[model samples]
Target chain A: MFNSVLDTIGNTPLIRLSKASELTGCDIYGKAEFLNPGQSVKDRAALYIIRDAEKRGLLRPGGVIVEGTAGNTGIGLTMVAKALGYRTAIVIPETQSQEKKDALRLLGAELIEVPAAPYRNPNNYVRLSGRLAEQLAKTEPNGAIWANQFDNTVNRQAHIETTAQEIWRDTSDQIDGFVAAVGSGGTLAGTAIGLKERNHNIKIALADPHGAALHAFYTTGELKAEGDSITEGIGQGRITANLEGFTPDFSYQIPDAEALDILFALVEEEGLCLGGSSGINIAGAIRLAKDLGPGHTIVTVLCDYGNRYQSKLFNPAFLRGKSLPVPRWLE
Target chain B: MFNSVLDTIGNTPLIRLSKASELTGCDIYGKAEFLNPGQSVKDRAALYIIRDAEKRGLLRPGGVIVEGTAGNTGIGLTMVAKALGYRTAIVIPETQSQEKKDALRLLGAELIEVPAAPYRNPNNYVRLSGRLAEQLAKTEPNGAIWANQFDNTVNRQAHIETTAQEIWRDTSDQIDGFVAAVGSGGTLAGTAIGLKERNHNIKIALADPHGAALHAFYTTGELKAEGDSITEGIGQGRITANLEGFTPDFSYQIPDAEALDILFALVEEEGLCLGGSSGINIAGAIRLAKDLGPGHTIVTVLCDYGNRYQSKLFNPAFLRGKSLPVPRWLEKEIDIPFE
Candidate 1:
C-alpha cells in the first residue's frame, strides 16, 4: 500500500472470541483495536481529529498539541503529531499508569502530570491541560491546541464514520448486540449511535465498572454508586460530549475481581494480550450472550494491548498486593 | 488476506529511514521486522521453522516446542505454537530483559530461566533447551521438537525466501548495500545469500558489537575482540549451520554505549521503539554509508521492538545511571553479534 506508519492507523480486524464462546454460549466478535499503529483504538479518533483540525486551520505545521489523557489517546496524539512534524505535550493524572507516561515520553511527547481530581476541580488534568494550552498559545508563535478527546465532537464523529461503518459491513447487517465500556466514550457510544441510525433494531449495552456512578446513571438517570475504579479508561465519573445524550438499552456492572480473572483466562486459552478494560468488555459480552442465548451475536471492543498493563495485570506480585486472587493459569 | 494471528508473521513493512540521511549521507531503508506479529524479525524464522518441522513429520498437533531464547524468538514460538494447538517451553538467560520474560509468560510458555553461561558450559541456555527437548520427547505422548534456530537452515531459508525478495521488489533492485547484526545469522547471512544470487554486485556487511568476536574472525581469521555485551539476540560464540559457509564483506564494530544512545535517538526522531540490536544495525548502516559516500543506497533491519527494552533503554533513571550521553540529536541521542 506504500504507507508510512501513520497510514496504518485503522482497519483493525473483527475477530471471533472463540474461547469465551464455550463458556458464555454466545456469538461474540471483538473489534480488535489493538492492531492499530498506536496499538489502540484511539488512533482513529486522534488521527481524524488532527486531520480535521488541519483542514479547518486549527492546527498548523510546527504547532503544539496538548491534551489530558490517561493512556492510549495520548500515545495516538504523540505519534500522529510527530509524523506530521508538530510538538506534542500531554497532561495526565498522576494516578494513571507509569507505563503510559513512559510510552508518551519515549514518543517525544512532553508529559505534564497533574493531581488526580474531579473534573470540576481546578487542578484536574483536563483543566490544567486547558490552562497549558492557553498559556502556550500566548507565549509561543505556533500556539497550542488542546486535544480534548473526551468532549471533542470529532472524536465521536470519527467512530461513526469509520469504526461503525466497518462493523456494519463486516457483520453484513447481521449483528444483534453491541456491548462495551467507555473512556472518552468516543468508541462505543459513537458506534451505538451509528448502528442504531442504520438499523434501530440493534441492541446496545454498556460495561460499567463496579465502583463507578455511571452504571446507575444509565439505569436510574441519577447517580447511585459512587467510588473509585481500578480499571483504566472505562467508567468515568462524568459523561463527556462523546456520550452527552446517549444511553444503551442495558448496563453490565463488571466487578474488578471477575474482570481480572477472565483476563488471565483469555491469555492462556485465546492468546489475546488484552488489558483490564478488555476483560470487562469480554465479561460483559459473555453476560449478554448468557442472557440472550446462543443464536444471538454480540460485538465488543478490545480497547488496548496488555503490554501497557504488564505491571498490574500480568505481574503476580502486583495482583497479590491488590488482594486480587492469582489466576491459576499463570505459573 | 483473512487469517488467524499466526498467519501475520511475515510480510513486515519495508521503508526508508527519512531522518538519518544527513548523519549517514546514504539513502537508507530499514526492513521493519518489528511490525511482525511477535514484534521482532525472529517471527519469520520461528513460524517458518515450526511449519517446516510439521511438514517433515518432526512435529505434530499437541506436540511440544522447546528453545533457549533471551529475546523475540521465544515470543514468536509461544504465539505461533499456542495458535496452532501446541505447547511451548523456552529457556531464557537470567540476565535477559524482564519485559521479554513477562511477555513469554503471558503467551503461556513454560519458561526456564537458566544461569547465563557460554555454549562451552553444560548449564548454557542452548544446552538446557536441547536437554529439555530430548527429555520432553521421551515423556510427552505427542513428542517434542527442539527449534534450534542457530543451527537450523530453515531459519535462514525463511529470510532468503521472504525478506530479501521484499527488499528487491520494494527497492526496485536499486539497493547498493545491506547491513545488519547477526542474530543466529539467519537475517544477515540469509539476506546476503539471497541478494547475491539475485545480483552479485550488491554489497553486504554486518553490524557487530564491540565485544563480539565475529567481526574480528571475519577480518583477521582469528578471534580478536572478546568481552561482555549488553545487547540481546546477537553475536553467538559459535558458528551455526545458518551461516556455516557464508560471510558478509565488511563489519562495523559498534560500541554498546553508542548503540544504546542512538536507540533513544530513534525513538524521538522516528517514533521507533526498537531494541538494542536495531540500534547497532542503524549505526552500522551509517558507518557503511559514510565509507561508500552519498551516492550509494543502504538497506538495514530493525530486529525487534523497544517495548522489550523500556525499563532499560527508555528509562530516564536507567540512562542516567549508565552515564550514557543523550545524543544532542535525540534531544543526537544513541549491539549485535557476528557469525
Candidate 2:
C-alpha cells in the first residue's frame, strides 16, 4: 500500500478551492502538483525524459544529461538524473533565485550561468544548450546525452500518461475546463490531447503572461512578442515547434501585477503556496469561470512550490516592489 | 482506497537518515510527522483531545473548543475542531510566526495573542488561557469548552493509540531506539509506553533543547526552571505535570546553533524542510545512533514543516547570523527535466 517518496510524486490531491470559489462564484479545484519528489509538476517530465532516453538507448551508463532551465525543471531533472546514476549540467539565466541554484547544486548537478537575454541569441541558454550538445557529441562522444525536454516528445507523453490521467481519475471525469500555463507548451498540449480524447467538449484554457507571443497567436492570426513579465515558466517570447498539434480553446493574457496579486491571495486565502505561473493559471481559470457560470468545475495546476521563491514572491519587500498587497493577514 | 485529507492526519512516512548516518556512524531513520493534514505531529494530539472531549459529553453542537498553544498544536486542534463542527479559539504567544497565525485564522479559529513571559505571569498565554476559560464559562455556559491539551491525558493517549501503533506496524518490531523532542512530554511518554507494551527492549531517547529543564529532570531527577530556546514546540523553561510518567530516559540536550546547523544540512542534503525542533530531534537521534553504534536503527520525529520559518531558518541571513557556512553547492545551476 505504501510506496517510496519518489513514487509519491505526480499523483497529488485535488482540493476544492473553497475561498476562490466564493470569490469567483464558480467551483474551482487546484491540483497540488508541487507535492512531487522535486517539488514540481515537472517531475513527471524528468521521470519520462530519463525513462524514454533509456528506452531509446540514447543514454548509457555515466552519461551526462544537459538542459537549459530556470529553476523547477532543473531541480526535477537533476533529481531523476542523479537517482538514475547520470550527471546533469543545467544552464540557467542569472535572473533566477539563489535558493533554487543552491538547491540544484546540492543535488550534485553542474551549473552553467548565462546572462538573461532573448532566446534567439546564440549565447542564450536555449541556443547555447543545442551548441553544447553538438560540442559534447564531438568531444565527449558517448559520455553526454542531451535530454532536450523542450522539444522532446517524451515531455508531452509524460503528461499524457500521468498528469492528465491523474486529473481525470481525481476529478472522476467531471472536469469542465482545464487551465494551465505553457512554458515549453508540453503540459498544455499533452493534457489537452488526453482530455479531448476522453471528452472533446472540455475546454483547455491557456494562461499566458501579458506581452507573451502565445496570446497574440491565440487571439489573432498574428504571432508577435513584446515586453517582458516577472512571472516565470509561462510567457515565452518565441513559440516552440513542439507546440504543433494542440490549439487551445481559449487564452488569457494576465498582467505581471495581476498574476502577483493572485499569487499573494492564494497563499493568504487558500493556504496553497505556489509559484508565479500558478497565479497566472488561477487568474485564467477565474476568467474562464466567469463564462462557465456557477456549478461548473474547473481544475488548474499548481506547477511548483513557493519555497524556491520564498525570498522573492513570499517576501514582503518583493511584494511591495510590484505594488501588490502583502496581505494584512500575514501581519 | 480514496480518503479525505483529514483521514491522512497521521501515519506519516519513514525516511532513512543518510546525513545522520554519516554523523552518528549508525543507521538512523526519521518519521516525517509534519506530512499530516495540519502539517504537524500535534495533529495526533488534537484528534484525541477533541474526540475525548466529545466522549466525555463536554462537546455538543455549537460548542467552542479552546486551547492555549504556540502554533502547531493550535493549528492541529483547530483543524480537528473545524472538521467536527466545533468553533475553536486559541490563545497563542506573540512570539509565534505570522504565517502560523494567518493559517489558524484561515481555518476559522479566533486567536488571542498573549504576551511572551514566564508561565506564572498573568499575561502569559497559559495563565491567560485559564482566565479566558473561566470568563467564557461565565458568559457562554454550554457553548464553550476548554480542550486543555498541555495537561490533558488525551495528548498521551493519541500517541499511544496512533503514532506508536503506526511505528510498530511499519518497523515490524525491529526499531532499536525511539527518539523525540519533549515539549509537553506526551509524545515521549505515550510512545514509550506503547512501544514497551509491544517490545520492552526498545530504548527511548529524549531530545531536549539546551535551555529546557527536561534534560536535567531526566538526568538528575531534579526539576529546574531555565532560559528560553529558539526550538519552538519543544523545550519549555517550566516542566508540565504531564511529564511525570516519562522520567528515566537517555536525554540529549541540543544547542540552538547545532540544531540550526543540522536543520540547514537536512534541507541541503535530504531536501526536507523542517523546523528548529525537528533539527533538535535530528541532533538527538544522531547522538543516540552514535552511542548505539553501527547496525542499530533509530527513529526520530520531524515535528513540523519548515514553511512557517521559510523567512528565518530557510533564509541565508539566518545562517549567516550563526556564522555557519552556506553550502556553495547552492550557487550552481543544474539541468532539470521540465515539461
Candidate 3:
C-alpha cells in the first residue's frame, strides 16, 4: 500500500521486448516508465526536484511551482505539487498536444501557453518561465520558484538515485547494455552513471534523432545537426548541465521513418502504445542488440504512453501532414 | 519483470485516502484499478473472458471477438485480443463519449457505432453485437464469438479469483468493508462473494447512482429506480446474470451532484484523476465509513482514469450544459482548497 501518489513514482517494471529480443537473439527489456502515475518517466524528476527545492528552502507550503516543458515534466510537476499542497504554474510550448494542455488544467495547474522557440531566444518558454517566477516572488505571499529541469542537476540525481537502481536490481547484474535517447539528458546521463558505477563492462549506447547534435558530437567531436525530427520533447541541439560529463560507448541516429515503423509494429504486434521517444529508444536498443551480437542483455526506457500524443503521433492526418510514415493499421 | 503487457493486470496498489480518512477518522483505501494496462478494472474481465472462450473452443487463433460496451470493456478486449492474435469488433453506443470511440479505433478495433437505446429495445447496441457475432460466424475464415460481458460469469469469476484475493491479502484481512458501484455487476458480486467466503464478518456495501435500481432493490426489495445520472457505464436498471446470488449489507444512493463534487475535489486535493464512477464509489465509501462509526477500514475501486472523459467531465462548458457544477479551480484564477 502507498501513502499517496508520490510513493508510486518509481519502481516501474521492466517489460521484456519479446519480438525484438527474438529477432536479435538477445534479451531486450524496456522499462515501463509510462506506468508512472503521471504517465511518464518525468514523475521521478518532478518528485526529486520538488523535494530538493523544499530542503533548500526555495519552496514552502502554499508556494507556486513554475516550469517550462514540452508537456510531461509540467504534468509531473503539477501532479507532485498538487499532492504537496502547492500550486503550479506551467509554461509550456504551444506546439505540445492539446491533450497535455487539457490534462495540466484538469490537474489544477495554472497553464501558460507560449509560442515554441529555440532555447537561445529570449522569448523562449524556458526563459519566460524564469521571468514569471521572478514576478511571482514579489506578488505571491508564499513566494515562487522555477524548476529548471534542463540544467538542474537535481533532475539527473533522480534517475541515478531511483531509476538506475531499479534497473540494476531488477536485472541482477545481468545487463550488458543500457540504451536511451536524451530528452533533458537526465535519464540517459544519470542512469548511465549509476549502471557504469556498478559494472563498467555495461556498454552505454546513446540514441539521437535526426535533429539532435549529440550523435554528431559523439562521433566527430563537432556539435552540428543536419535535419529536424517529427519526434517531440527529445533530440537536443546542445547538452545541458545534466549531460556535462556523460559519454557513451556507442551512438545511433534514428530516422523518423524507422522510429515510426518500429512504433507501429510494437503497437500492432506487442500491444505497447508508446510515444515517439520510446520508439526511438526501442529502435536504438534493437540496433545495439544486433551490434553486440546474440548473447547480450539490453535495457531501454519506454518514455511515455501514446495517449498524450493522440493529436500528433496517433493521428494519421498529422503523420501525412509531416510527410511521415503512418501506422499500417491506421492506413 | 513481465513478459507481456497482459501480465501487468491486477495487483493494483491500494492508495490511502488521506483526506477522506482524516475527515471521517477511518482508514479509507482505494484500489488503483486505473493502473491496469487498459486503464480500468475491465482488463481483468476482458482477459478471463477471452481465455475462457479459447478453452471452450469458441475462439480460435484467427477468430474475431465481438462485444458491445460503453467503452472500457471494448478497449480491454481489443488490447488483450491483439496480444493473443485475434481481431475484435466493438459495438459501442453513440451516446458514450467520443474519446472512447477514438481510443477503440486507435487500438485497432473494428468499431461499429450504434444509436443508444434502452436495453429492452431489439436495436440496442448489446443486441446488435449479439446479431453481428452471428453474421461473422459464416463470413470470417476461422469463426466469431460474442463476449457478452454483461452476463458472462467469467467476468465475475475473474474478480473472485484475482481482485478479491489481492485486496484481502494486501490488507492482511483487516478490511472491515467493501464498497462499489456496479455496471455489469461483475466487480461487486464476485468481490463480495470472495470476501464473504474468506470472512463473512466483512460488511458488503452497494453504491448506486440515483438512476440505478440496485439501491432500491436492496432497500425496499423492488427493482425500481428514480431520476437519472450523468455517470456512464454504471447504474444498471436490471440485475445482470453476474449479479445473481449476491446481497449487500448496506446501500447508498449517490446523486450526480455528490459524485461530481467528490470527483472535482479528488482531482484538486488528492491528485487522483478518476472518472465519475470512481467518485460515486469514493462518496459511497465515505458514507459507509461514517455509518460504520469511524475507526473502521473501508475499501473501494478507482474504476478508470478521467482522461477518457475529458470532453464531458473535465470540460466546464459540457458540465454547465448538463446543469452540473464545475470545479472551483476552473471557475476562479486563485487556487482554493476543495474543503
Candidate 4:
C-alpha cells in the first residue's frame, strides 16, 4: 500500500528474459526499475540522498535541491524535492533528449542547460551545478545543497539497502553473475558489494558503452578517455568516487550498433520498453552470458522507461540517421 | 517477486494526493494503476481477459488476439499475447496519438488503423475490430478472440477480481467514494460492484468529459449524445454493455480546458505525471471533494502516464494550438490545490 508517491520507489519486480534466456542457454533476469514512481533506478539514490540530507541538517524546510544529471536522476530528484516541500534546480547537458527537459519542467524544476563536457572542464554540468548551488544558497533563506550524485556515497548506499537485497531475495541466492552500467556508478557499485557479501563467488561485470573509458579501465586497469556513445546512463568520461571501491571481474564493450539492435529486439520481441542504457546493459549481459557458457544465471537492469527517449531512441528517422540497424527486430 | 512482466500487472499501490487532501480537508487517494507494466488501468482488464480466455479455452496456442483501443489496452494485449505464445493484431483509431501507434509497432503488433467515428458507424475502431478479427480468424491457423473491451463482461470481471479488491484491501474499506470515467466501463462498473459488495455505503461517482453524454445520462437518466473530447479512453458516445445496471450517485462534466489545465497542474504541483483521462479524473475528484465537503475519503484512478502524450500533452505549442490555457496555477507559484 502506497501512503505516498515516495513509497512506490523501491521493491521493483525481477522479470525474466524469457527469449534472451532461451537464446543464450542461460537464465537471465532484469530488474524492472522503470516501475519506480519516477520510472528509474535513480529514484532509490535520490530518495536516500534527500532523507539523509534532511537527517544531517543539510536540506531545510523550504530549501532548493541542486544537481547535475544526464536525465533520470534529475527526474528522480525533482519528484523527491517536490514531495518534501523543496524546490529543484537541475543542471542538464543540452545533448540529452528534449523529453527529459520537458519532464523536469513538468515537475517545476528550474533547468540550467550546459554543454556535455568532461568532468574536469569548468563548463561541465557537474562543476556548473556546484557553482549554481552557491548562487542559489546566497539568495534563499533556507540555503541550497548540491546533490552531487556522482560523488555522493548515499547514491551507492541506496542500492546497497534496496536494489541488491531485492535481487538477492528474488533470485533465491541462485544468480551466478550480475551486470550493470555505470551512470552514477551507484547501482553497479552497491549491487556488487551487496551480492559479494552474501556469496563471495558471485561474479560482477561492467556493461560499458563503446566510447566510454570504463571498458578500457576494467580490461587494462587504466582510464583511456575518448569519444561518447548515444547511450544515456552508462558512459562516463571520468571515474566517480562511488566507483572507486571495487573492480569488476569481467566486462563487455557494447557497441552502439549491437546495443540498438538488441534494444529494438527487446522491444519488438519481448515487449519490454527501456531506455538506451538498458539496451547497453542487456546487450552486455547477453554477451557475458554467451562468454560464460551455459548454466549461468545473469541478472541485469531495465534501467528506465523508453518513453523518456521517444524522440531519439524510439524515433525511426533518428535511428536511420545514425545508420543503426534494427535487424528485422524492429519491424 | 516477479517471474514475468505479466506478473507485475496488478497489486498496484494506493497513493495519497497530499496537496489535494490538504486543500480539500479530506483524505484523497489515487490508485496508481499507471504503474502497471503497460502503464495503465487497462493492464488489469487486458491480463484478466486474456488469462480468463486461455483458461476457458477461448484462446488457443498460436491464436490471434484482436482488440480496438484508444492506446493503452492495445499495448497491454500485445504484451500479454506475446508472452503467452500468440500474435496480436490491434485495431486503433487514426485519431489516437502517434506515440501509441509507434509503441504498438515497436511491440511488433500488426496494427489496423480505423476511423475515429461514432459507435454506430461501421468504420469506427470498435466495430471494425469485430469485422477484422473475423477476417483474421479465417486466415490464421488457430482462431482469433475479439477482446471486445466495451461489451465484454470480462472487462468488469477483471476489476472485480484485482483492481477493486486491491483498492478495497488497501484502504481497509475506509474510502467513502470512488470516482472514474467510463471508457469501456470496466474500471467504473467493476470497481463499483467490488466495493459495493463490501459496503453499499461506498458512493460511486462518474467523471464525465464535457463533450461526452455520460453526464446527461447520470443527471437526468437520459442519453444526450454530443461531440468528442480531446480526452482519450473516456467520453464514449454509446453506453458500453459493461456499464449496464450501474447508476452513479452524482457526476461532473469536466471541460477539456480545465482537464488540460489540471493535467499541467498535477505535473507541476503534485509531481504526479498523468495523461489526459487522469486530468479529467483528478479534476472531477477535486470537484467531488468540494461537493462532499471535508472528512470524506475519496479514491480515483490515475488512468495512464503523461509520457504517452509527450508530443501533445506536455507540449506548450500543442496547448497553444488548441487555444487551451496552461493557467497561472501551472506556473512556479507552489500554491494550494484549488486556491
Candidate 5:
C-alpha cells in the first residue's frame, strides 16, 4: 500500500476544518495541499505538464523548461525538471517571496526577473516568456520546451484524473460543494468539470481575491483591470482561456484584510500553516458554508505551505507591508 | 488504515542520507522525526508521559501537568494533555521560538518563562521547575505532577517501546548503527537499549554539540563545564539518571558552524527542512557513515520541523547573524552542470 515518499505527495489526508466549522457553524473539509512534494498543489500541475509534454515528444533529452510563474509553480516545476534531467528557467515577478526564490535557486533553476506589468503587455512575463521560448527554439534546436500550464490541457487533466477523483473516492461522493481560489484558473475549471461529471448536482464555488479581475469577470462577464492584492499566486490581471467557459454555482470576493485574518485564524485555531491563497479559499468557504446552512459538506484546498511566507505573511514586519491592521487572532 | 492525523504522531519515515554518505563516505539514514503531528519526535515522549501517568494513577482528573522544556516537548505535552483533559503548565527558556509559544498557548497551556541557565544550576529551568512544582503542590489539593523527562524512566521507555521498534521494523533488522544527539538523553539511551536488545552488535553513536560535556564524559568520565552552543534541544551540563547505565559505542563533537552547514545541505539537497538539533545529529551520522564505509546502514533523526525557524535559520538575516556565508547554491545561473 505504501511506496516511495514521492507516492505520498498527491494522496494528502483530508481533514475536517473543525475549528473553522465550529466558528461558522458549517461543516468544511480542507484538502491538505501543503503536503505536496514542493509544498504546493502546483506539484500536480507541474508533473502533468512535464509528463504530457514528454508524451507529445515536445521535450527532448537535455531540453530546458521555461515557464512564467509566481513562485510555487516554479518550485514544483524545478523539482520535476531536475528529476527528469531537464534544466529549468522561470520568469517571475519581483514581488514574490525571497524564500521562494532561495528554494528555487537552491534546486538549481535559473531565474529571470521580469517587470511586473499587465497581462496583455507584450513585455509582461507571460507574453515575454512566449517570445523567450521562440528565441530559445532558434538558439537551441530541439533543446527547449515551454510548459504553458495556464492554457495546457494537461493542467485540467491532472485535477480531473488525480485531485478531483481522489476527493470523490475519499468522501464517497458525499461532498456537497467544492471551493477553490483561481490561480491560472486550471484548478477551479478542471476540478469543476470533474466534480460535475461525477455528480451533476455538486456545487462548484470560486473564491476570488477582491482586487482580482475574476470577481468582475465571473459576476458581470465584463473584463476589469486587476489591482494590487496581498494574497499571492491567485489573483490575475486578466482572465485566460482556461476560465473563459467555466461557470461557478456561487462565488465570493474576499478582501485582502479578511483573507489575511482567515490565514491567521487557520494557523492559530486549525493548526495548519498554509500560504496566502489558502486564506482566500477559507474566507470564501466560510461565507459559502454560512449560506448553505447546516448538513452540507464544503471542501477547500490549502494550496501551499506557509514556510515560504514565514518572512512576509507569517512575520509581523511583513504583515505591515500589506497596510492592514494586525488581526487580533495573530496576537 | 488511515486514522486521525493525531494518530500519526509517533511513527516516522526513515530515509538514507545518500549525498551526506557520499560526501562523508559514511552510511547514514535519517528518521524523519519532523513528520510527527507536532513536527517533532518529542510527541512520543509527551504522549507516553501523560498516558503512563494516567495509567499509574499519578495524574488524576483535575491534576495539573508541569514541565520545563525548550519548545517541542511543550507542544507534544500540550497535545496529549488536551486529549486527556488535563491542565498543563510549561516553563520554557526565553530563547525558545515564538511559534512554539504561540502553539502552546493555542493548546491552552499556562506558560511561564525562565531565564536560560545551565542544567544543574538551581535557577535553571529544570531545577526551577522542580521548585515550582513543589510550591504548586502546597497551594493546590490536587497539585501538579512534574513530568521530569530529563530523569524520568518513562521518557526512555517511550522511545524504547515506540521509536526504536518502529525503526527496526522499517529497516527490517538491517540497521548497522543508530546515531542521535542527547538533550534529555532519553532517545539515545532508550534507542541504544532497544536496538542492542534486537542485535547486540549494533553500534550506538552519540552526536554531541561542541560545547556539551557529554563528549568528554563519554570518552574519559571527566565532566567539563558547559559552554554556549547553537544546536538547541540537544546538550546537557549534567548527565541525567535516564542516561545512567547506557554507554555509547561512538561519539562525535559537531561544531555549530558545521552543524548549520549540514542543516543547509539537508534543505538544499534533500528538500527536508529540519531544525538545528537535527542538523547536529545528521553531521554526526554522516561522520559515522564515513567510518563505516559503503552498504552499512545508519539512522539519525530529524527531531523537529523548520517552520519554527523560518524567521531565524531559514532567513538570510539569521544566517548573517552567525557570520556564515550566504550559500552560493542559492544563486541562479543558467545551464549549469547538475553536480
Candidate 6:
C-alpha cells in the first residue's frame, strides 16, 4: 500500500548469515539492501540526493538529474528520477559492465559512456558529467543538477537518517559491531557516525576490497594500496567528503579471490545471490567476528543483487579472463 | 525479519493504481507480486508445490525438481528448490527469452531447451519435461519429480490460501472486483473460488491476452481463440485441472498494443516497470472499473518485473518487427478498448 515505489526504498530486512555465523561462532546478520526497489543500497543515496536538490531549489519540476557512475548509482538515480518525474543523464566509464549500461538505458537514462580514467584525469567520467550538467542547465528550461554521490554529504546523510537508524532500531541497540564495504564512503561513514551517536560501544568496521586504499589509511595512516579488485563501485583511492570527519574502529582488506569465494558460497549454501561488494562485506564481517571472539553480534550490508553483474561476476568467461576461481557448485 | 527468502513469499503490498483509478473513477489496487523474493506470483506455487511434495514423501531431502517453464515458474521453482536443498531441471522452449534461460542457469537449474510447439505436439516442452523427469527418476537414486504447474491443484491452492486471503484482508472485504490473466489458470481459479467463498458479490474476471482462449470460453462456453499474442507464459487452449470447477463473471481480451501501451504508461507515470502479464491485468482492471461504474474498488496482480523481458517487450527492434505502437508519452494516454 505504498503511495509510490519511492516509499519502499529503505527499511530492508536484516537476515542472519547462517554459514558465516556458524563458522565464526558469532551472530552474523546482513542488511538485505538487494531487496531495495532499485535492487541496491544506492537507492537511498539517489532518493536523498534528488530530494535535497528539490528542497534547495536546485531542481524544478522539469529538472534533469546527471551523475557519473559505473554501476548501481546510475541505475538508482534513473529510477528515482523517473519516479519523481525528472529526466536523467548518466555518464559511465566504458570499462564498466554492459549489464549496468543496459540497465541505465532500460530505466530511461540519457547514457553517455566516456573513456575510463582516474579521478585526476580532466576527462574522467565524474569530471565530464559535472561539465555536462553545467552545459545542460543552460540548454534545458529547468536547470540540470549533478548528483555528486561521493562528496555530496547528502549521500551520507541518507544513510544516517535511514540505514543507520534502521539497523540500530532493528537490532534493538544490542549490536556489537557493524561492517560494510565503502563505495562512495557514504554507507560506512554515515552508518558509523549514526551508530556511534546512538550507542558509543557499537564497534564500526570497514570492508575494503584489494584495490581500495581505505584499509591502508585505517591501518597505516597512509592512503595507498598495492593491487586492484574485480569488484565494482567500491574501494577508494582517497578519502571522500562523506568520510571527512569519521573513521571506523577497524578495517579488513578482502582479496578478490576471498570475495568471490564468499559470493559463491552465499549462493550455493545460503541461497543468497549477491554482488561482489556484498561478498566483501560478508568476508569482512566474518574476519571481524573471529577477531572479536565468538558470540559477538556482527552486522553487514548485502549491497546489491548478482543479476546486475551476470555478464561480469557470475560469468565464467569473465572469471577466466580475470584469473578468478569459479564457484565450486558450478564445477 | 524473515528466516529465509522463502519466508518472504506472500503478503505483498496492495498498491493503488492512481492513474488507472483516476481515469476510470474507481479505486484500482494492484497486488505487488513483483515484490516476492523470486519476483513473481509463481513463488507461492513453487513454495507450496515443493512443500506439498515433501509432506507427501514424493520429494526426499535429496530429490531433484523438474519443470517445463518458459519464464517465472522455472525461476520460482529454481529459487525455492535451492532454499529447500534440492536440484532443479528446467525445460524451456528455445523461443523463450535468453534472459529467462540465463536466469534459470544462474539460479542453478540444469537447463534443457527444447523446440517450441503447441500443447498437442508430442514433443511439446511440457510433455518433454514430463518424460525427462521419468527418465531421470529411473537413473537417480533419490528420485525426480515434475512440478506440473498447470494441472497441479497445489498451484491454485497457493493462491487460495495466500493471495486471495491477502487481498481480502488488505481490502477489508470492500473489493468490488478481482481481475487477472490466466497463465496456468491457478491464480484466476484459486483466487476466484477463495474470494467467492468470502463475498460472493465480489465479481471475479479474467484478463486474457490476444491468443488466450479463456475470454472466448467464458463468453461462449467453448475453448477457441483468434490470432496470437507476443505475450509469453500465459493463455491456454484447454481448461487446466486448476480451473476445472471455476468460472469467472466476465472476461476481457487485451490486445498486444493495448497491453504494451499500458505497460509503458505504468513505467512513465507510476514508475512501476512490470512484465506483459501485469500490463494485461491493469488494462482489464480499467475496463472492468468503467463497466462496473465509478466509485467501485478493483484489484489485480503485478505479476513480475520487466527486467526479465528487457530483450523482447522493451526492445525497439522487437516492437518494430512486431509492428506494435510505441508509447504515446514516448511518442502516450492509454488506448482503452471498449465494447
lDDT of each: 0.78, 0.73, 0.88, 0.82, 0.75, 0.85
Per-residue lDDT of model 3, residues A91-207, tens digit only: 888888888888888888888887878777877887778777777777777758888898899999999999999999999989999999997999999999999889998899999
Worst 10 residues of 4 chain B by lDDT: B330-339
Consecutive 10-residue window with the lowest summed lDDT within model 1 chain B: B330-339
Candidate 5: clashing pairs of residues: B25-B290, B26-B289, B26-B290, B27-B289
Give per-residue CA lDDT, model 6, range B1-339, as digits (tens). 456777767888887888898999899999988877777889999998999889887777678899988768888888888777788888988887677777878877787878899888988988888899899988878779889998899999999999999998989889899999998899989999889889989998899998778888889877678988877778887888999988888889999999998888777667677888998999999999988999999999989888888788888777889998654433212111111
Best by DockQ: 3
- Scanning candidate 1 chain A in windows of ten residues, the lowest lDDT window is A1-10
- lDDT per residue as tens, model 4, A211-230: 78888987887888565577
Off by over 4 Å in 6: A328-331, B94-97, B327-339
- List the candidate 4 regions with Cα displacement exceeding 4 Å: A225-228, A287-296, A327-331, B56-58, B95-97, B226-228, B257-262, B287-294, B317-324, B327-339
Clashes of each: 11, 6, 0, 0, 4, 2
Assess the local accuracy of residue A30 in candidate 4 as a C-alpha lDDT between 0 and 100.
91
Q: What tens digits encode model 3's per-residue C-alpha lDDT throughout B240-301?
A: 89999888999999988889988888888878888999989999999999989888989999
* Candidate 1 root-mean-square deviation in Å: 5.7
Better of 4 and 6 by TM-score: 6
Sort by DockQ, top down from the best = 3, 4, 6, 1, 5, 2
Per-residue error for B16 in candidate 1, Å, reads 3.3
Q: Which stretch of 10 consecutive residues in model 5 chain A shows the poorest summed lDDT?
A: A1-10
Over the stretch A87-149, how does candidate 1's per-residue lDDT look in tens digits?
787888887877787777777777777677876677777777777777777755665787888
Cα lDDT of model 1 by residue, B46-133, tens digit: 8888899899887777898999886588888877887677878899888876766777887788888778987789889988898889
| Per-model C-alpha RMSD | 5.7, 5.9, 2.9, 4.1, 5.3, 4.8
Per-residue lDDT, model 6, residue B207, is 93
Choose the strongest candidate by TM-score: 3
What TM-scores result for chain A when each predicted structure is judged separately against the true chain A? 0.96, 0.94, 0.98, 0.96, 0.94, 0.98
Model 2, A119-163: lDDT tens digits are 666677777776676566555544676667677878888888887
Query: Of models 3 and 6, which has the larger DockQ?
Result: 3
Return the lDDT, model 3, position B176: 92
